[PDB]
Each structure stands twice: as C-alpha cells, then as structure tokens.
Symmetry: C3
Subunit: 553 residues, 3 copies
C-alpha cells in the first residue's frame, strides 16, 4: 500500500469574487492579528517569566537627644536599637523604663479600671495575668483616689502603664535608612542590585525627584502615604517598604530597575484587646546593694518590613510557539462568519418575511447562488427510501417511511424540488382504486410487499404519461436502448431473453433518469404501474415473476 | 489585482441527513463543550493569578511557674523568651542553667562515654571540641564510678549534660499565640488581613468550631497533628503554622479567607549526631567577689515557623482568550471521528470479511455512497501516464510505468474501474504478434518509442471493436464530427487538409471519451492500432508521419 | 426541524496520488509531532508545577583561639555569636572592642582626616554625627602629629577606627555549618528534607565528591566561587547558600534532590560612603568603681543567607489537554504549504517567466491540473453582470459595469475563457453602426435601457452566426425545442401563444448554452440583435413588446 501513503487530500473550494466578503474577511483577519499581536506584546507572552530571590541589608542612621527627668541622653540607632539589618528592622519611637525594680510588696498600677472598692475584693494567692503580680488579698492605697489591690511583684510596678504622649523619640522621623537589595533570577542566570556605580549618595528618596535613591527618611515614608508619624510613634506600628522588580532581561528591551512603594501593615483601628501597635519587653537583671534588682524597658516603635517581589522575563521559543498555536484557531473567524451569513441568507424565509419588510436586504439574495455552489445535500440511502414523481405536479415526493399495507400512491412523503437538468446535454437533441390514469394494473408481487408498486403516474384523473410520444422515444424505443447497451458494451449479443431483460432494465433506468433527473433519486425512484407494465409488455420475460424494485445497497 | 483581494474561499461541503452521524456530532460537541467549560470553571483558567506578599506579627501569652531546687520562679513569655514577633518565634520548654561559672580546673562531664580508663589516656594541652575544655593530661575522679578527664575550663562544667526529663516548662502547652497576618496581591491591588471587625476575642482556634480564630493554644497545635508536646518539650523542635490564602478577587465570587494547618518541620527520628531538637546557648558574663564569672543557659524549645502562601485570582480577558483558542481545535473531534468512520467503512475489505462475519454491520455500507459523494481521487499527470481499455474486459488499466522496448499490450498496469457514464446525457439518444483482433498494423513511429502504439483492442482473440456499428456512428461518422467541430466553431471552413486533421483529432477524442468516460483518463488514454489506423484511413493526411500521442502538459 | 438537527457536513476533498505531496505531508507531520513532543517532554508541560515553602535550621560548629594583647581566649560559635539558626546566620570574623568606657572628655579618633588645623576650627556645642561626640570647641593633642578636636563622649573614643588587619578570627574559614532544609509542596501534598536515612555524617560538601552533604566548610564556600575569605573577613560580607529544588513528583520519574550553589550577595566594590561589608555595634553597660561604664564591640563578619527556591511538578490532565489543544493547529502546516504550492504553480506567470528560464521546474505544471480539480471560481451575480460572446473570437467577455447610454458592443469588459464543453454529452450526436454582421436590427426597448440589446455576433465584418446550419439545428429547430419542452413537461399542450413564448425562451436558452457553455454565464449572457430577432421572427408574439433580458435574481 505504497500508493496509500502517497495520497494527499486537499479540500474542494469555491472562490467568490465578492467585494463585501473579501473586505469582511480581511477586516476580520486584521482585527484578529492586531489583537493577538497586542496581547503578545503587552503581556510579554513570548517571555518565560521567573520569580526572584532577594537579599536585603539595611543601615539606619539617627541620633535622638532625650531630656529625661534632669539627664540629657543620646539614643543612637546603631547600637541601642539595631542588631538586625535585613528584611525587617525596628526603630524605637517610645519607651517605658522602670529602673531598679525589687521583688517586694507594692500596689498594682490602676490600668483599665484595676482598682478595689473594698479590701475583700482582692483575691489572696492569685496572680493577675495582666499585672503579673501575686495578690496578697489586701488593697493598698495606691493613690488618693486610685487605690489598687495589694500585690507582691517587681516594684515599683508599672504594668499597664500607658505609653507616654507625646512620644519621647519623635525625632526618629528624621532618621534615614539605606536599603541595599540584591536580587537574582536563578533560571535566567541574572543578578543585579539596587545601587549601581555613579549614583548620588547625598540623595534621599523622592517619588519624582529621586525615585531611585535607596536612602529613605522615615517621616517621608509616612507622609507619602498619609500617615502621621507623631501619632504612630506613641504606640508603634508596622510599615512596609515594597520593592517591585519588573525586569525585562531581553537584550533589545533590557530594563531591570526597582520601584519603591510604602504600605502600613498593622491595622490602624485594631481593637484595644488585640494589642494595637508594636512593642516588646526586655529586662536587664543586676544585683544592687546585695539585693537582686531588674531594669525593665517596654519599647514602642515601628517595625519596617522590606517586601521584595517581582519577576524577570526572557524570550522563550516554546512559550511563543504555544501562544501562536493557541491563537491560530481565531483566524477561522472570517470563515465562520461569512459561511454563517451565506447559510442564513440562503434560506427561503428571508425572501418571504425579511426582504418584503426591508428592501435594503434584497441584494443579499445572491447567498442562495453561493449556497447552491457550496453545498450538495444528500440523504441516507436506507431501504425504506423511495422517490415518487407525478406528471400532474412540478416537484418530487420522498417516501422514507414504510408502507403498512397502504398503497404508495396514498403516502404523503415530503416534497423536494426536481433537479435542474443539464441543459447543455439536452441542447444536443375496471382500473384499480388508486389509479387515476386508467392504464395501471394490479401488482403481481406477494401481498405483503404488494403496496410498493401500487403507484400511478398522477394524483388526479387525466391522460397517462405513457400517452406522450416522449415516453415511446425514450423508454420504449428499442433502438435507443440497444444503442445505450452497445455504448456500455460495444460487442453485446442481441439474442435470447438476456437482451430482453437488459432492455427492460434500461427502460426503467431511462424513465427514472428522465423523471427524477439525479442518479441519487433515480436509484430509489419508483415507477408507476402504467409505465412499468407497458415496459414489461414491450420487453416481456420468458417465464417467472418480475422481481420489481431491488435495494441498490 | 483588486479582484484578487476581493476573493473569498469557501469549502465545498456535503450535507448528510443521517440520524446516526448528526447524533454522534452533537454528542461529541456537547462532550467537548462540557469538559472545556468544567476545566475553565474548576481551574479558574479565566483568572490571572498572583502570589501574595505577607507580614506576620505574633503575640505569645503565657506564665509558667517553676519550682527550682527551693525557689518559686515565674517564666513570662513576654520578656524572658520573646524579643522576636514575626514569621518565626521561639517558646522555651526546657533549660539547663549553670550559675556562677569560674574559669578553673575541674573534671569533664561524662557524656557519651567521656571517661578515662587511666590517667595517661587524657591528652595534655588538647581541648576536646565537644566539652570545649583544655585537658591537662590528668584524669579527675568526677564520680565514684564515673571518673572523667581533667580539664581547665568554665566550672562546674556541664557540657554534654542531657536535657532534664520531664521538661521543666511543660506548662508551655497551655500558652497561646495570636497571629496577625497581612497579605497583599500587588498586581491586583488587593490587601486584606486575617482579623476583621466583629471577630470573637475569647475564641481559640478549632478546626471545626472556630476555624478562623487566630489565637492558638500550642498543645492544641500539637494534638491536631498527633504530636506529643510533653516529649517534644524535652529536646525541642520546630513546628509550622501554615496559612493558606486561596483568594478569589472577583466581585461576583469574592472569597479571601485564611486556612490554618500545622506541620512538624524538624525530623522526629534525627540521628543523635545531627543535633536533634532545637536549642541554643547564651551566656551572661558578670564579675563576682572580684573574680570574672559566667552564667550559661542552654535553652530547649519549639521554634514555630509561620508559613504564609497563596494566590489571588482575578478575571483576565487575555487568559480567557488564550484558553478558548487552545480549546477551539477540540471541536473538530466530531469531524475527525465521523470522517474516519466514513473512510473505514467505505473500504471493499469490509464487505468481504466484516459484514459476512458480522451481519449487524451491513447497514454501514452506505459509507461507500457517502465516500463517493465526498472524495474525488485523481492521479498525477506525469508523462509516463497511460490508460488502456480492452473491449473483452469490464475495467481499465493505468500504465504509469515506462515501456522498455516492450509493447504496451504486454504491460500489467493496475486495474481501475470505468467511470459510471452520465446516463442523463445518454438518455437523449499476417497480423502482428501482439494483435488479437487481426486488424492492427505495425506502428510507423521511430523504433525507440514505437512500443507505445503497439496496442490491441482486446487481450484475447475475437472480433475487433471497429466491427461494431457504434464505432462507425461515433468515431467514423464524418457528419457527427463535423457537427461537433461546428459546435466548437460555428463558422468553421470545411476545406483543406486542416478539416481532415480536425476530424482525425475529433475521432480520437470521441473514441477516448466513449471507452474511458472521464476526461482525466480520456486525456491520457491510448488508442489501439486498429481504431487508430481505421480513423487515419478514413481521415488521411496529405503527407508526413502522424505525430501520435502527445503529452497534454 | 428534526431533519435539521440530524444533518452532518463533510468537506468535499480531492485525493492526489503524488509521491512529492504525500512525502512532504508526512515529513511536515513528523516534524510538527517531533517538536511538540520534545517541547512537552523537555518543559514538562503535562505537569502542573507548584512553588515550595521552606524551613531552614542551621548549626555552626567552630572554636577560634585568639591571643589578645596577653590573654589567650576561645571564641565558640555556639553562644558568643549564634542565637539565630534559620534562614540567615552570622559568623563573626573580626571585632573592635573598647573595654571600660566612661562618659568624659577626650580627643576624637582621627578618621577620614578628622583633625584640626587650629583650636577655633572645632565647633562648641555641636556633636559630630560620625564620632557621635559633643565638641567643646577645643582641640586636644590626640597624637604627636594627629591632633583632633576635643569632644565629650564615651572615652577612650574609638569611633571611626579601622577594622584590624589581618582579621582576628581568620580561623572562621575552618568552621562548618550543617543546614537542615524542610520543603513542602502544599498543593501536591508532598514534603521532603535534605537529609535522609543512610547519609554520611563525617562528609563535608564537595560539588563532585559529596554534592549532597549538607555540612559546609565556610572557606570551601568561598573558594568554590573565587572569593578570598581572608580579605572578606576584615570588613565582612554577605554570602548566599542557594538551595535549588527541581523536584519531579511523578512516580515513574520521581526525583526530589537539592542542588547547592553559592553567590556573594554584598557588592565587593561598594563605595566607602555606602558602608562596605557587614558589621553591627552592640554595647554592654556596667557600673565599675561606682562610675557607670560601657563596653562597646563592633563586630565584623559574614552573614550567610540561605536562599531556598524551586518548583514541584506532577502530572495534570488539564494542562496536557490545554497543551495539545494549543499545538493541534500546527498540524495544518502540511495543508497550508502544499495548497500554497498548488496555488502558486497554477499561475500562468510561471509558464511565461519561470519555466523558460529554469527548465527544472517544468514538471511542476501539473499544479494547474491540481488547481482546476480543486477550485471552482464564481462571480457575484449582480444586476450589472453580463456576458458577451463574439463568433470571431475564441473567448468570452464579462461586462460587470453599467452602460451609460453606450452600446454593449462598444464595451471592453474583461476576457474570460470559454468553459470546456462536456465532450461526453456531445459524443452522442442600412444596418446599424454597431453591427458588423449586417443582420442586426435597432432595439425596440425604451431609450434609457436600449443599449443592452445593441450587440452584434462579431467584432469585425463577416458572416452572421445565424448563417450557420447549427443555428437552425439548435436554436430555430421547432422540433428540438418541442422535444426539450416535453422533456421538461411531457404532457405539454402545443397550442396558443403560450407555446410560442415557451419556444422563444427555449431558443434563447439554447443559444446561451451553446455559446457560453456554463449555466453561470448562460444565465447572464446577452444575445445579439441578429440571433434575438431571428428567434423572435420565427417565434413571434401575438402583441406587446418583448421584455428582453430579465435579471435572474
Ligand atoms: O520581624 S520580627 O521578627 O517581628 C522583628 C523583630 C525584631 C526586630 N528588631 C529589634 C532590634 C532590637 C531590639 C532590642 C532593643 C533594646 C533596647 C533599645 N533601646 C533602648 C532603650 C532604653 C535605653 S536606657 O534608657 O538607657 O535604659 C537603652 C536602649 C532598642 C532595641 C532588644 C534587646 C535585647 C532583648 N532581650 C534579652 C533577653 C535576655 C538577655 S540575658 O542577659 O538574660 O542573656 C539579654 C537580652 C530584647 C530586645 C528588638 C528588636 C526586627 C524584626
Ligand atoms: O528562625 S530562626 O532564625 O531560627 C529564630 C531564632 C530565634 C528566635 N527567637 C528567640 C528569642 C529569644 C532568645 C533568647 C532567650 C534567652 C533566655 C530565655 N529564657 C530564660 C531562661 C532562664 C532564665 S533564669 O533561670 O532566670 O536564669 C531566664 C530566662 C529565652 C530566650 C536569647 C537572648 C540573648 C542571646 N545572646 C546574647 C549575646 C551577647 C550578649 S552581650 O551582653 O555580650 O552583649 C547578650 C546576649 C541569645 C538568646 C532566643 C531566640 C526565633 C527564630
Ligand atoms: O538577616 S539579618 O536580619 O540581617 C541578620 C541579623 C543578625 C544575625 N545574627 C546575629 C547573631 C548574634 C549577634 C550578636 C553578637 C554579639 C557578640 C559576638 N561575639 C563576641 C565578641 C567579643 C567578645 S569579648 O571579647 O569577650 O568581649 C565576646 C563575644 C557575636 C555576635 C549580638 C548580641 C546582642 C545585641 N544587642 C543587645 C542590646 C541591648 C541589650 S540590654 O542589656 O540593654 O537589654 C543587650 C544586647 C546585639 C548583637 C548578632 C547577629 C543574622 C541575620
Ligand atoms: N428505481 C426503480 N428501479 C426498479 C423499479 N422496478 C424495477 N427496478 C429495477 O430494475 C430491475 C428489474 O427487475 P425486474 O425486471 O422487475 O425483475 P426480473 O424479471 O428478474 O428482471 C431490478 O433489478 C430493479 O433494481 C422501480 O420501480 N424503480
Ligand atoms: N489519448 C490519445 N490521444 C492521441 C492518441 N493518438 C493521438 N492522439 C492525439 O491526437 C492528436 C493527433 O496527432 P496525429 O494525427 O497522430 O499527428 P498529426 O499527423 O500531426 O496530426 C495528437 O495531438 C494527440 O494529442 C492516442 O492514442 N490517445
Ligand atoms: N441570457 C439572456 N436571456 C434573455 C435575453 N433576452 C431575453 N432573455 C430571457 O428570455 C425571456 C424572454 O423574454 P421576452 O421574450 O423578450 O419577453 P416576452 O415577450 O414577455 O416573452 C426573458 O424572461 C429573459 O429572462 C438575452 O439576451 N440573454
Ligand atoms: C527634624 O529635623 C528638622 C530640621 O533639622 C527639625 O526642624 C524638626 O524639628 C525635626 N523633627 C523632629 C521630630 O525632631
Ligand atoms: C499628628 O499627631 C499629632 C499628635 O499625635 C497631632 O498633634 C497632629 O495634629 C497630627 N497631625 C499632623 C498633621 O501632625
Ligand atoms: C473590642 O472587642 C470587644 C469584645 O471583645 C467589644 O465589646 C468592643 O466593642 C470592641 N472594640 C473595638 C474598637 O473593636
Ligand atoms: C494546662 O491547664 C490545665 C487547666 O488550667 C491544667 O489542668 C493542666 O495541668 C495544664 N497543663 C500543664 C502542662 O501545666
Ligand atoms: C507523651 O510523652 C510523655 C513523656 O514524654 C509520656 O508520659 C506520655 O505517655 C506520652 N503520651 C501522651 C499521650 O502523653
Ligand atoms: C547515626 O549515624 C551513625 C554513623 O555516623 C550510625 O552508626 C548510626 O547507626 C546512626 N543512627 C541513627 C539512629 O541514624
Ligand atoms: C584551618 O585548619 C588547617 C588544619 O587544621 C590549618 O592548617 C589552617 O591554618 C587553618 N586555617 C586558619 C585560618 O586557621
Ligand atoms: C563515609 O562514611 C564512611 C563510614 O561510614 C567514612 O569512612 C567515610 O570517610 C565517609 N566519607 C567521606 C567522604 O569521608
Ligand atoms: C587573600 O587576602 C590576603 C589578605 O587579605 C592576601 O594575603 C592573599 O594574598 C589573598 N589571596 C589569597 C589567595 O590568599
Ligand atoms: C564614592 O562617591 C563619591 C561621591 O559621593 C565619589 O566622589 C567617589 O568617587 C565614589 N567612590 C567610589 C569608589 O565609588
Ligand atoms: Zn394509473
Ligand atoms: Zn399512467
Ligand atoms: Zn488488433
Ligand atoms: Zn481491433
Ligand atoms: Zn449584426
Ligand atoms: Zn449577426
């Protein structure tokens, strides 16, 4: 089967020289091409994108002078507050220091209504989880009007004390942080950094003037997003410094720069029971005067979380191939649309309701010509298929249903048009109850299938089709049938009953071709009893029943 | 070439009114549509998904009362153990404290068999990397039966001492951690948090009852995954609190909630040489009695790593377009399947082996009618192409191969069927060694290509095709040929040898059309010597050799 | 419309038994299949890939003996330097210690030219942001030739002092770090770790010998990437330990192993004003002799950032379906290419310029036969469409344009070939100024549209087509026209003016079919005045004007 391999199939097509259809086709093609190209370029769907891996190294620089009372102290954001310099860092903005605490008995701080109306109110032997002090069951006069429960704990106890207002280290808004960010795209084998040779050092970040300076003033960070540093400093907070890397690693469009943005990460309206702000407690234990003491510091501040995210794209051929394959089927849109137009306007419904109503749609009736040049309807050749023609009608009846002992003459079928004959070929030129022509005869077939041949040439009384001279010229012309037989077999022998059978079949074939036109219908046609029996009379059989119609398949 | 632009191509098609094929087509279309729709909806392939950036802020709350001996102490997880409150946090569950250590000489702890069988066993001047103590070469009687090597180091040395069992801070399983998680999808410009207004505060996380409370009891964290906190507390561990954000940012299906899950991250069965658990050593140096001392604490505990991951989807038109384009080609499945059925059942092999064996497959022989209505086979018109017809055979022979001095009569070729003639058109109606008809003549062509015309009308002896009256009516009927010529050229001049050549060509064309049927074969047909020379005799040439068959292309 | 549902469309095709085209088709199909398969397998486009979530637990092991002067001390990387063991860790490689500092007056260190040329140079009451010391306005003689400004600060002040060279803790290159890495793919529900049972413990990482040992010597880490640990130790740095997980979670191809790589993350050539290296300052405050003192340590070292990244793939049916759908349209490449070849080589331009120039391209002229068997050109049947035939020419003229009072005879039109007549069907066989035949008559139509019928049988003077006997046999043969009418309607009545109209129309139809061939052109043909008026004379009308050509649609 070598020839089976070497076959090539190509579809049969129909050019149409239509201005409208060609214009529509090209418009739709340009539209699809424009959109797919735009999507590819905008979304960079030709690039295989990779996420980055990041390293952050921060350096906070600030000295705050505090007058605590009176002692003038300096708070350097180099050793006092910054042992961690990386993704996240903390800048202290307030503190509550309790110097020289001794484990002894003292009143508890009156926080959130922590007081007593009577001595018996306090519970002996139970330590409050907030004050973290063991109650002795007595109530001390903490203040003149703010007496609180007696407790044995570190004293003077300050647990529950509110953060000082205004914040002690407000000057922290004047501090600066230098962020060094190293990224890599391991798949693309590309690494870069946010500081490059030839960058200003005295610069400070501004979203317009200095959008690439990695030195940030904290107050500016807060102002850029409408946050009040003075208020946030009191209880603390969490702020995000987002670094976005939208990086194009293609040589012809290379661009890998960071974009800095800011976002408050703590909730401003956190409920008082969910620990608003940001703080931590750390203690330093020291023995003074032979008595173990402890210095406790509750520090409030802003934790800055540096969030680095982004992707790096580089041209990938496989991605482009996949995208093109995905978008290729969209170029059949023109075909789909124009074929749908042809099919819709080829209907007989439009000439009856649409065009009469709208006369601007009349010239869209050429779709009927475009649809006959495009489609060839055919029917399933099932055994029950039969075609019927009546000389008193202009069209043909297809009886695909079975005859339940009912004469074929009395069967509705379904009307179909007679095919237009090839004019070029022709340019070279007592009776039964179901019979209206009077020339039909009872069928000799077995009673069960006798109704197939119970057909007449016409539906109303009149002259039989056999009376026409064309019937004799075509169907009963022994000369013409012999010529057709010789055309099929030039050396045919004109002797015996074989020739009489060959001529009878040719007469049937001739009537069916003459009155059904297409071979598709001529194959399943049914001859009337009149024509059938005239043919048989003029081409008899030596002996035996005529088989009648036999299923072609 | 404006008309070239305005062309529209549409494929020629063939409707088939088949219940089976239409049903199959629609079933396959519904199947493909259902699957593509289901995939789109389930996988959300219309959504452009983005990973999140996260910030975590934790607050551990717990006081553990320890009776160390006797002194009753409190271990507050606010200052003693928690200066870091973010992605990861540590809860101490055990400790080994060595108070008031002095750099002097003392025995080494007997850990992992660290002992001596003799004084000379110990190495002088060498410091063990485990005990971290410089050996003096002597062995001290550390214990009555556990003497160990003498060392100069911090003393009393406790290096290698096992973690106390049961864990001192078992009460840490009753501690609670509040996790505040802020996420953002920077591309989608969406941010949310795990705590929202109107949430219960007294709640504690339960996977069913309170699946959204971000307050977790550590013992519950361990119980939920079948881990024993009491055992893990002895040597420590690492536990993961996974926060999954499967977030849909579309308005009509908006859902962005966290799902909390837990996973032990350290290996339970870590080898003793790979440092099982989690611990760290930290020292506090202080001068006591004028002698520099050091307090060493080895802390065992559980490090909790909060792992936040997830994606946020939002409708993207480009993604939907790409998905639809990818899935469009699957709607040709019905076409592929039904065309394959037609092709397979159109074979002549099925009527010979399949249908006789299986009679339920007989009604699938209409595929032969569907395949003749669908396909038009053609052959490459190469110069070696020739077609041959023998009046004693019912079919035709295509000789695509070359004649190597061998008469065309004696060439196998390959059998092809004679086309069915258009019955509608016809309804209007001494000898050489290779000659079996006796009426053929030697070819006058040059010897090299003389074998082309060495053909007879039949393969077996018999009457020549020329003897039929149809040959004279069609081929030798000067009247008919003149009528055909006039049809082609109405004003043709019937004079000179030009008319005699025009008639000879028409006679050849007529024989070829009559005996090959299709113009495709009639073009490459080969006339027998008998017919050829009868035609030439009745349409002679004034002078010169007859050219013979000439390649149409 | 049940039959409307049960329709199946199949395209009409044309097999071609061509070795070249079949070979090209199969080559292109194999090429496309090979590439799509290769892309699928290489890129694993059948796998839905997921990023990992990671946990890292490190254990650094090293003791460095330092001789500070003389006191011999040990620096253990277990308690002195490592409280953090996770994603990032710090190994100290150098330090500057200032023991027993007292807040008093002293000279400032001469760093970066920090000196005075005169006492008045120093500013009173202003504290330098670098030295962090309040100036008293005087200049102390710090050194014999390096006098610096007087300042009140912690003393002896060492701010700005350069890091010692060579680094004190060079022995840190001999330290080892054990990295335990736990990953998970939450979607795939897969977790693994970098240490598995049966792994060597005494091993140390080597890229070839021990590529999976998670124990790393720091000096080896630096040597592997061409970094000098001795130099980096002086000022410090940041090094990355990248752990890549390319993990295949499919059972038949399961592989999930880590690949370790190293990358310096700090910039080697950082500007001196951008704080090169890595360091931090931490202080320990202690009261000595009743005077508050502070010990300051500036530590230089290398921060190691463990960067874990990777994806885990597992077979997904939806991904495979999407990929196949995307790549399906590429299998029409053979069709596109071969159809383009057929179209290009079917042009009449190739036979005139290409083949004469290049004779190796002659056998590609069969594409003209392949293109006539494949395409059926048609024209839009618009009202202005007209076809014209002149008996003195071999081809046909299509006049699609309007006649602006200009005789149709004098219209250029555009030449088209006359269709090849179905030879099988035929094998069964005083004057106006615009008239060249002399037998045409003035048109009786209204003057506005009178020019349509102003056509002659020929373009040059000569005999009229009507003079041919074929005109009388075909067009004026009342017998033949009656036979055609009877063929259409066998029981037609031959009486009245109706028959005379039926015959006149048939004569028009016969001329148009005889001289235009295709019904497409015969429909829009235009008869000459000579033939038209001869037909009308021999088939007159009782009374009334002849309507003339009427638009078929
Ligand atoms: O992302 S997150 O994870 O959330 C995250 C988490 C944390 C950070 N950064 C960060 C950096 C430093 C500290 C820290 C600290 C301490 C003091 C100040 N300022 C100060 C105030 C007043 C005075 S005063 O007026 O002169 O007094 C002097 C100085 C600023 C910061 C800190 C240090 C030590 C400890 N604990 C400890 C426990 C036991 C022992 S021991 O001795 O027993 O061994 C010793 C120490 C706790 C905190 C905390 C967080 C960033 C991100
Ligand atoms: O993700 S990871 O990266 O893996 C990661 C890593 C770490 C964490 N959290 C975390 C939080 C705190 C500590 C820490 C600590 C200390 C003590 C207790 N409890 C305690 C026990 C007994 C007694 S007692 O009985 O009363 O005695 C009292 C208290 C709990 C925790 C800690 C603090 C300081 C140091 N070092 C240091 C070095 C030099 C100097 S200096 O003075 O020389 O300057 C001062 C201090 C080390 C550890 C460690 C880790 C989370 C995640
Ligand atoms: O990714 S990143 O975020 O960038 C990142 C960030 C950090 C890390 N690791 C890391 C680990 C430890 C330290 C640390 C430290 C201290 C000392 C040595 N060696 C040493 C030298 C000389 C001598 S000597 O010669 O014997 O003297 C003895 C020992 C090594 C490391 C450190 C400890 C404490 C503090 N601060 C503090 C503040 C207030 C108070 S308080 O008392 O006031 O409460 C107490 C303490 C700061 C640093 C720093 C970073 C990894 C990654
Ligand atoms: N289309 C069509 N074909 C028919 C009809 N009647 C007979 N035939 C065909 O013509 C042949 C004639 O068979 P027939 O002469 O009746 O039986 P016979 O005596 O054995 O030759 C059969 O093989 C049928 O296929 C008819 O009414 N319509
Ligand atoms: N198909 C076919 N065509 C033929 C055959 N012989 C001749 N022809 C064609 O008919 C024409 C007749 O040429 P011929 O009369 O032999 O040469 P002439 O004397 O120059 O006219 C040639 O152009 C051929 O194309 C034949 O055997 N088969
Ligand atoms: N193709 C073509 N058709 C024509 C021409 N002239 C007339 N016809 C057609 O033939 C029919 C003859 O109409 P005609 O006899 O002139 O008008 P009548 O007197 O009303 O019958 C019309 O319906 C036209 O469709 C012509 O020149 N070319
Ligand atoms: C920040 O600095 C400016 C200029 O030095 C000063 O005017 C302002 O008061 C400072 N802010 C704080 C909060 O100290
Ligand atoms: C910010 O907060 C402070 C105190 O918290 C307040 O005095 C001030 O009005 C607020 N707004 C601005 C713009 O400073
Ligand atoms: C805080 O929560 C309590 C209940 O725990 C509720 O009564 C109160 O209204 C809440 N306040 C805010 C500001 O959310
Ligand atoms: C946890 O708390 C419950 C109730 O307060 C108590 O019964 C239990 O013993 C506690 N567990 C530990 C380990 O202390
Ligand atoms: C857990 O561990 C402890 C000691 O490690 C042991 O007594 C107990 O049986 C274990 N199981 C449970 C369920 O507590
Ligand atoms: C630990 O590793 C040692 C070898 O270093 C081996 O002999 C021993 O069996 C291992 N034990 C476990 C529990 O893995
Ligand atoms: C590292 O160890 C080797 C062998 O113990 C030694 O030769 C080398 O000097 C050491 N390096 C340093 C910097 O101490
Ligand atoms: C692997 O382990 C064996 C003992 O189990 C040890 O002898 C060998 O040295 C180890 N491999 C290396 C490279 O040290
Ligand atoms: C590394 O640096 C040291 C001092 O920084 C220098 O002596 C040495 O030549 C450098 N190169 C190597 C290979 O050690
Ligand atoms: C550092 O920056 C300064 C300007 O701030 C410039 O003058 C100097 O040349 C730079 N040096 C290097 C090594 O980049
Ligand atoms: Zn009848
Ligand atoms: Zn009848
Ligand atoms: Zn012969
Ligand atoms: Zn012969
Ligand atoms: Zn004329
Ligand atoms: Zn004329």
């Amino acid at each position: 089967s070598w020839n089976d391999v070497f076959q090539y199939e190509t579809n049969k097509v129909t050019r149409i020289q239509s201005v409208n259809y060609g214009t529509i086709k090209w418009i739709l093609h340009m539209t699809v091409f424009s959109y797919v190209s735009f999507a590819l370029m905008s979304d960079k769907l030709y690039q295989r994108k990779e996420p980055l891996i990041s390293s952050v190294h921060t350096k906070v620089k600030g000295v705050a002078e505090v007058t605590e009372n009176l002692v003038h102290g300096i708070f350097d954001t180099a050793d006092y507050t910054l042992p961690l310099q990386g993704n996240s860092f903390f800048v202290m903005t307030n503190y509550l220091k309790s110097e020289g605490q001794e484990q002894k008995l003292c009143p508890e701080y009156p926080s959130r209504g922590k007081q007593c109306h009577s001595d018996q109110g306090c519970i002996k032997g139970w330590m409050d989880p907030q004050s973290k002090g063991i109650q002795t069951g007595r109530c001390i006069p903490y203040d003149q009007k703010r007496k609180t429960c007696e407790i044995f704990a570190w004293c003077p106890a300050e647990e529950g004390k509110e953060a000082p207002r205004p914040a002690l280290l407000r000057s922290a808004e004047n501090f600066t942080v230098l962020i060094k960010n190293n990224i890599d795209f391991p798949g693309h084998n590309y690494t870069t950094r946010n500081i490059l040779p030839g960058m200003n050092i005295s610069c400070t970040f501004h979203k317009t003037w200095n959008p690439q300076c990695p030195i940030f003033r904290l107050g500016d960070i807060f102002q850029e997003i409408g946050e009040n540093f003075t208020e946030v400093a009191v209880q603390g907070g969490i702020m995000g410094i987002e670094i976005y890397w939208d990086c194009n690693l293609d040589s012809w469009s290379h661009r890998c720069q960071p974009k800095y943005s800011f976002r408050r990460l703590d909730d401003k309206y956190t409920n008082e029971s969910l620990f608003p702000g940001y703080n931590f407690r750390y203690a330093k234990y020291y023995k003074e005067n032979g008595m173990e003491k402890r210095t406790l510091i509750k520090a409030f501040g802003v934790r800055f979380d540096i969030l680095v995210f982004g992707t790096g794209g580089k041209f990938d051929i496989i991605q482009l191939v996949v995208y093109i394959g995905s978008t290729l089927s969209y170029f059949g849109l023109a075909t789909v649309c124009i074929d749908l137009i042809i099919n819709t306007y080829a209907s007989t419904c439009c000439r009856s309701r649409v065009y009469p109503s709208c006369k601007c749609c009349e010239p869209c009736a050429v779709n009927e010509y475009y649809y006959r040049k495009k489609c060839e309807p055919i029917v399933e050749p099932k055994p029950t298929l039969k075609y019927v023609s009546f000389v008193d009608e202009p069209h043909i009846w297809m009886v695909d249903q079975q005859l339940l002992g009912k004469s074929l003459q009395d069967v509705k079928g379904q009307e179909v048009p007679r095919p237009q004959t090839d004019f070029l070929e022709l340019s070279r030129l007592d009776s039964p109850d179901w019979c209206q022509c009077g020339n039909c005869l009872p069928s000799q077939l077995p009673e069960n299938r006798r109704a197939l041949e119970e057909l007449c040439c016409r539906r109303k009384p009149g002259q039989c089709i056999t009376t026409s001279e064309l019937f004799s010229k075509i169907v009963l012309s022994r000369e013409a049938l012999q010529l057709l037989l010789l055309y099929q077999e030039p050396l045919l022998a004109l002797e015996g009953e074989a020739i009489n059978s060959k001529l009878r079949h040719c007469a049937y074939r001739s009537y069916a071709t003459w009155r059904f036109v297409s071979q598709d219908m001529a194959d399943f046609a049914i001859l009337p009893s009149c024509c059938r029996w005239k043919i048989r009379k003029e081409f008899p059989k030596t002996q035996g029943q005529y088989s009648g119609f036999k299923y072609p398949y």
